Structure 1
Amino acid sequence: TKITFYNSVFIETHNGNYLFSMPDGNVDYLILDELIDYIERLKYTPYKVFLILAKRIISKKIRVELPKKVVLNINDNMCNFASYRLMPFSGFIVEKDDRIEINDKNWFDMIWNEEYNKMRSQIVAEDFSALPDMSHDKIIENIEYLFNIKILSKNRIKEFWEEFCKGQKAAIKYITQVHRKNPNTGRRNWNPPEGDFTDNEIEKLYETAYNTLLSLIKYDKNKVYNILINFNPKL
């Protein structure tokens, strides 16, 4: 930082030859009638003068300025009205960890829909609030067979237990959703059985999974947990 003193501190960096208040070198920022000649004496007229006087020196073809996170506008049709170029804009300033965005109503509408979908899809009817019949051994036999072949998996048994904690009705909803044969694809959400088979047999094992899980929802929680804990040791 080359500094020189005049009858005036002429610091000469690479970001501009600043001078707080006439050297013969190029002067970039002048940190400033008698006043006008001082600027006229400087060769290579300064880019900005940091100061009634401003009106005149603007008309002397010179820029003025009269005395944190980066702010990014996202909102752009303006108008001349009341001299300065301008637009009406109502919006939202958001304060990010390294920036300040200036968003509009469409952003808030987007995040309103994104939050409302989260809100509305958290409670599903009688949470924590005509089933077929099966003997306990038959439930053990069918869950064991459909656990060896990969239909009732540990993720399926886990997600059965989580919904059955939330009541019988949510468990029937989950089992009906997994067994549902989509009319456009002809496919159920069961994981397909491993081992060579035939589509009638595969459909009957899917039906067996539907009836064995549905006959387990009528049982007591502790009895359901003690049936499934022999297969998925977590839950």
Structure 2
Amino acid sequence: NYLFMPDGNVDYLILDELIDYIERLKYTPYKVFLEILAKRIISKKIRVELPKVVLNINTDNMCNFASYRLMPFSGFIVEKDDRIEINDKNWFDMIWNEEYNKMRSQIVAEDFSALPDMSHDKIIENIEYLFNIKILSKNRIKEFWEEFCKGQKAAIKYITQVHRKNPNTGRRNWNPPEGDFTDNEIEKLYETAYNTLLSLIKYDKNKVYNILINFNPKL
């Protein structure tokens, strides 16, 4: 109910005779929309106003201080899709750590900027053998070519990352071979993958590209 004396209930009024009219209403107004007269109306135990969803996500400590109560907070306003929110330093530290991890993820080593030898026939034979027992898979060959096109150092780094037998677990990052094999043959095939990829690391780009299309045509 909005009134701008109506005997019915009046929840809101929009305005010493004023005081008399306000007290003259049946029941009492919840809020009245009115300075000194507003504070006098406050003195008659009636509320005054004197004229994206906002979300304060924060801890709380309140110092009463003046008549108005407060809570000291230098912080951040974040605008979102349909809401505006208020966060502290720790939110910005968290997004700073996540962004800074995203930064070093980039510009790693020398992108687009000490190797064994074996014949070209040997390299096709070893990649052809490890294609069909699911060690040098298509994802492996793809990420080979991605780490190779950024340089030889990145390809050596990725190959030493995959071939690294972790002393805690004893597990290299290669795909396990398919078929009946004992353990010694499994490590010998992993060493074969090591030597084959590190030996094609020494070759030029068009002698690698032409060796990995007949295994990955979407290199």
Pairwise CA distance, 1:121 = 1.3
For residues 124 and 49 of structure 1, the distance between their equivalents in structure 2, rounded to whole angstroms, comes to: 65
Question: How far did residue 82 of structure 1 move?
Answer: 1.5
TM-aligned CA deviation for residue 77 of structure 1: 0.4
Q: Distance in 2 between matches of 1:193 and 1:122?
A: 33
Deviation at 1:32, TM superposition (A): 1.1
SS in structure 2 at match of 1:86: coil
Cα distance in 1 between the residues matched to 2:210 and 2:3: 84
TM-superposed CA distance for 1:129, in Å, is: 1.1
Mapped partners of 2:21, 2:124: distance in 1: 100
Secondary structure, counterpart of 1:91 in structure 2: strand
Residue 58 of structure 1 deviates from its aligned partner by 0.4
CA distance in 2, matches of 1:125, 1:188: 22
Per the TM alignment, residue 230 of structure 1 is displaced from its structure 2 partner at its CA by 0.4
Following superposition, the deviation at residue 87 of structure 1 comes to 1.4
SS at match of 1:57: helix
CA distance in 1, matches of 2:63, 2:198: 68
**Deviation string, structure 1 residues 96-118 (Cα, Å, up to 9, x no partner):** 01100100000000000000000
TM superposition shift of 1:144: 0.2
Q: Gaps (5+ residues) in structure 1? A: 1-16
* C-alpha distance in structure 2 between counterparts of 1:78 and 1:92, whole Å: 19
CA deviations over 1:1-42 (Å, ceiling 9, x no partner): xxxxxxxxxxxxxxxx1111x111011001110100110110
Instruction: Give CA deviations for 1:151-203 in whole Å, capped at 9, x if unaligned.
Output: 00000000000000000000000000000000000000000000010000000
State the alpha-carbon separation in 2 of the partners of residues 104 and 153 from structure 1: 48
Q: Secondary structure at the match of 1:90?
A: strand
Q: Secondary structure of 2:77's partner? A: strand
The runs of at least 4 aligned residues of structure 1 exceeding 3 Å deviation read: none
Which fold has the larger relative contact order, with Cα–Cα distance below 8 Å and residues 6 or more apart in sequence? 2
After superposition, give the CA deviation of every residue in 1:88-145 in whole Å (9 maximum; x if it has no partner). Answer: 1000000001100100000000000000000011111111111000100000000000
Which of 32, 43, 46 in structure 2 is aligned with 1:49?
Answer: 32
Query: How far apart are the structure 2 equivalents of 1:111 and 1:156?
Result: 33
SS in 1 for 2:74: coil
Q: Number of residues paired by the alignment?
A: 217
Q: Which of 149, 152, 157 is equivalent to 2:136? A: 152
Identity, % of aligned positions: 100
1:64 CA displacement: 0.2
Q: Tell me how large the CA RMSD over aligned residues is.
A: 0.5
Cα distance in 1 between the residues matched to 2:114 and 2:73 = 60
Return the TM-score normalized by structure 1: 0.92
- TM-score, normalised relative to structure 2: 0.98
Residue 53 of structure 1 and its aligned partner are, at CA, apart by 0.1
SS in 1 for 2:70: coil
Structure 2 gaps, min length 5: none
